[PDB]
Amino acid sequence: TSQVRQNYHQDSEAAINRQINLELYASYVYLSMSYYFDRDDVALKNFAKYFLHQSHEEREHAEKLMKLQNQRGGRIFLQDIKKPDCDDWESGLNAMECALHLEKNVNQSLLELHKLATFKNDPHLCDFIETHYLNEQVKAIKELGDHVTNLRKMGAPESGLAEYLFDKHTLG
Amino acid sequence: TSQVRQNYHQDSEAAINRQINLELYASYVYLSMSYYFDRDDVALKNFAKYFLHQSHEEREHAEKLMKLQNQRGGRIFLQDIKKPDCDDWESGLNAMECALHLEKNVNQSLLELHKLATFKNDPHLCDFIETHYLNEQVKAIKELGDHVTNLRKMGAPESGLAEYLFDKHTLG
Amino acid sequence: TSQVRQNYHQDSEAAINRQINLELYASYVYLSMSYYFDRDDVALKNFAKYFLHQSHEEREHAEKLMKLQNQRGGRIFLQDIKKPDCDDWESGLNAMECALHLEKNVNQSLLELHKLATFKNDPHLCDFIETHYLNEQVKAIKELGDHVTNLRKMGAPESGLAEYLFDKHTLG
Amino acid sequence: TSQVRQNYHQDSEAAINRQINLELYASYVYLSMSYYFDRDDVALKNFAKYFLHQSHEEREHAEKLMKLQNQRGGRIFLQDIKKPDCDDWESGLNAMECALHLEKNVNQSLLELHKLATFKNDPHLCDFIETHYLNEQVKAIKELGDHVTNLRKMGAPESGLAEYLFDKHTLG
Ligand SMILES: [Fe+3]
Ligand SMILES: [Fe+3]
Ligand SMILES: [Fe+3]
Ligand SMILES: [Fe+3]
Ligand SMILES: [Fe+3]
Ligand SMILES: [Fe+3]
Ligand SMILES: [Fe+3]
Ligand SMILES: [Fe+3]
Ligand SMILES: [Fe+3]
């Protein structure tokens, strides 16, 4: 037992480890999506910067959970990081949509995790989730919903002009 | 009676009080429109900022009349600020059309306030309107006209691409 | 149903919309209170500047709730903004006492909007309330508590001298 | 007849010349009032600085009318500047009440000089009055109204303490 540990239940330790892997997973989805738009037959340079920025942000989230695990006396346990479901992401509107489906599963995971932290009476783990992850997911999800909408209204994906002008008037 | 009152007819005092409610009403409409474009199925961020600017200007027109009422020795008498007509504004073109209708209705009320003040041989009240309101209405009305014309000519509302480009390139 | 809505109960949607009305009503009371100390027969410049600031900060309180509704996928429905209880607030001490009542009123709504968010297991909404409204009302209520206490111990409202000196020294 | 005179009635010529006298008389009252608070047995430094400013701004009010007469082709005819009603204005509150009377007096003349310019269809003279004298008197009369109200609610003139504190805090 760790000398710094206090009020940190074993089940939150495991649920922090699991959230670490999901956050790494998401960073790797975003990496995958980013270099898809770097492709010379997709070629939406700001879609690329976007998802690459998100990718780095998501690994930033994973490192913040690993720091916390150590602050609370928990022990990190890492697992394989599954390859993304896709190798090709089809179009910009399509890519925005999987990102939105992705942040809503990261969100469901945090929400279930905050729920556990409430049952196990850990207010420090609860504020940690609240400050650094909860509004962040709410913002992310609102952002991606805005993008999907403008893309649909412009004419994407059957219009390449739509994804071209969006690629630069919104993500530039 | 007020120690400062002078050539300030009670009809004026009442019409100023009504004008204050009209400006507050307008401000409330513009607030409702502003946040209609904030929402995730609309996502026209500069329409939302345009109208939030108009909401704050109208609120500031109201407060100016309240200063004047107290300036001339009248007494402020606030009414309920009634709920705007629409909760959903359909589109950017349509929001712009309602805004035109509104500033033109505010102008007509503002013009009636002026006919009154002439009838009452109140010259200070006349110059107050001339300086701080009449040209404002003429300018506001002209601007929304321009905006209507351009939106129709770009193919709105049936073009989703028109409102989006109009958002980037006229309101940003 | 909205593409960003996740874990955002119908009940909470309605409660926010209501808190929006309330924050708008409070901005109006303060507006009404503000221009009463501008009267030539009351003449408290700093009391007036005080409530105009409070009024404007209550408007921002409402716009922030309007933003949140759209972030969470909820749907703004506005309401008549009913006129404030008074058109004549008697004295600076009476006016401050009304605000103390008014702010404890809004505290009430928020605490119940929070219990409701506890009931519906919405931690994001909860910390949103925790971070942006709760300590503000605790501060706002303590600020007015101090003001009311000072005016009483000075001789207000019988001493008009008390209110003149408060106006320059605590609000200048 | 003057080479620049155009649409400038004999009647208006005479009315301006009269308003010139009046503005000069008001500068003299204020002058007289000013050096009464300099007395070693009254001793209100800021009351004194107050009326000396008002006196000087009334002189500029007269010189501006002198300028206008020559712009319009009219012909200045000056008059005795009669001595002010008092040589002893009793107290700061009484002095402020006299100014409120005096400024409502000049408001009177201007409003009638304006009706006259309406009667003679002289829009230039009208807007000249609108722009440079009307809102100044509305401001001047509201300023003194506030001052009178504050001194009364403080205890003036019975409390010499009231007038000492007004002198530093509203006029310093
Ligand atoms: Fe992200
Ligand atoms: Fe994340
Ligand atoms: Fe307006
Ligand atoms: Fe406007
Ligand atoms: Fe407040
Ligand atoms: Fe509030
Ligand atoms: Fe003092
Ligand atoms: Fe003056
Ligand atoms: Fe003058």
Author numbering:
A (entry chain B), B (entry chain A), C (entry chain C), D (entry chain C): 5 to 176
What does the literature reporting this entry say, word for word?
In order to achieve the proof‐of‐concept objectives, we chose a 24‐mer human H‐chain ferritin (HuHF) nanocage as starting materials; subsequently its original Asp residues nearby the C3 symmetry axes were mutated into Phe, and the resulting mutant is referred to as 3FF. One ferritin molecule consists of six C2 rotation axes, four C3 rotation axes, and three C4 rotation axes. Here, by a combination of the multiple, symmetric interaction sites on the outer surface of protein nanocages and the tunable features of phenylalanine‐phenylalanine interactions, a protein engineering approach is reported to construct a variety of superstructures with shape anisotropy, including 3D cubic, 2D hexagonal layered, and 1D rod‐like crystalline protein nanocage arrays by using one single protein building block.
3FF molecules present as the cubic‐like shape from a point view of the C4 axis and are packed with neighboring 3FF monomers at the C3 corners, showing a molecular patterning of body‐centered lattices. Interestingly, after 1 h incubation, 3FF ferritin monomers (2.0 µm) self‐assemble into cubic‐like crystalline arrays having different numbers of faces with dozens of micrometers in size in the buffer (20 mm Tris‐HCl, pH 7.5, 200 mm of NaCl). The X‐ray crystal structure shows that 3FF molecules assemble into body‐centered tetragonal (bct) lattice, being consistent with our design. Further analyses revealed that the C3 axes of adjacent ferritin molecules are parallel offset and the distance between two nearby C3 axes is 9.5 Å. Among three designed Phe‐Phe pairs, two of them at each C3 vertex are involved in the aforementioned π−π interactions between two adjacent ferritin molecules (Figure 2d, we defined an interacting aromatic pair as one for which the distance between phenyl ring centroids (Rcen) is less than 7 Å and/or the shortest inter‐residue carbon‐carbon distance is less than 4.8 Å according to previous reports), and these two types of π−π interactions are shown in Figure 2d, right panel. The conformation of each π−π interaction is distinguished by the center‐normal angle (θ) and the normal‐normal angle (γ).[ 27d ] The F123Ab–F123Bb pair takes an offset stacked conformation, while the second pair F123Ac–F123Bc shows a T‐shaped conformation. Differently, the third Phe–Phe pair (F123Aa–F123Ba) are largely mismatched, causing C3 axes parallel misaligned with equidistance, resulting in the generation of bct lattices rather than body‐centered cubic (bcc) analogs. It is evident that each cubic‐like protein cage interacts with other eight monomers in an isotropic manner along the C3 rotation axes; such isotropic interactions between any adjacent protein molecules extend in 3D space, generating cubic‐like crystals. Taken together, all these findings demonstrate that 3D crystalline protein nanocage arrays with a bct structure originate from the designed intermolecular π−π interaction and exhibit high selectivity for Phe–Phe pairs rather than its analogs.
